[PDB]
Design a protein around this ligand. Structure first.
Ligand SMILES: CNC(=O)c1cc(C(=O)N[C@H]2[C@@H]3COC[C@@H]32)cc2c1OC[C@H]2c1cccc2[nH]ccc12
Length: 112
C-alpha cells in the first residue's frame, strides 16, 4: 500500500541520517540529550518534548509511525528543540541545519 511505501522511504531517510556519510554533523542527534552530563540544568524546562534519532529508530522498529507525516513531525521536533535551546552561533545549530538539509531534500522525494 501507499502508507507502507511512504514509510519505507522514511526508513531509508532514517538509515541515511544514521550512516557514516553524515556522522560528522549527525552525531549530536544519535541519542537523547543527556542534560545532567552536559550541565544543561534548564534543558527539560525549555524542551517539553525531547526527541533524537535513536527514539525515531525505536518508534519505526516498533511500527509506532502510522504515516510519513508522523515520522517527519518527530524528525522536525528534534531539529526545532535544537533551534529553541541552543544559541544560533553554536556548532550544534550549524550541524542541525546541515542534517535538516539532508532530511528535507530527501523527504521532498517522497513517492506519491
Ligand atoms: C541535540 N544536542 C544538543 O542540543 C547539544 C547541546 C549542547 C550544549 O552544550 N548546548 C548549550 C549551549 C550554550 O548554553 C546553552 C546551550 C551540547 C551538546 C549537544 O549535543 C552534543 C553535545 C556536544 C558536546 C561536545 C561538542 C559538541 N559540538 C556540538 C554539540 C556538542
Amino acid at each position: 500500500g501507499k502508507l507502507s511505501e511512504q514509510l519505507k522511504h522514511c526508513n531509508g531517510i532514517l538509515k541515511e541520517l544514521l550512516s557514516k556519510k553524515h556522522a560528522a554533523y549527525a552525531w549530536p542527534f544519535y541519542k537523547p540529550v543527556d542534560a545532567s552530563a552536559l550541565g544543561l540544568h534548564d534543558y527539560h524546562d525549555i524542551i517539553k518534548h525531547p526527541m533524537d534519532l535513536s527514539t525515531v529508530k525505536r518508534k519505526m522498529e516498533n511500527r509506532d509511525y502510522r504515516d510519513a507525516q508522523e515520522f517527519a513531525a518527530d524528525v522536525r521536533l528534534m531539529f526545532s528543540n535544537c533551534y529553541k535551546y541552543n544559541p544560533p552561533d553554536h556548532d550544534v545549530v550549524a550541524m542541525a541545519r546541515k542534517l535538516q538539509d539532508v532530511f528535507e531534500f530527501r523527504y521532498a522525494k517522497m513517492p506519491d
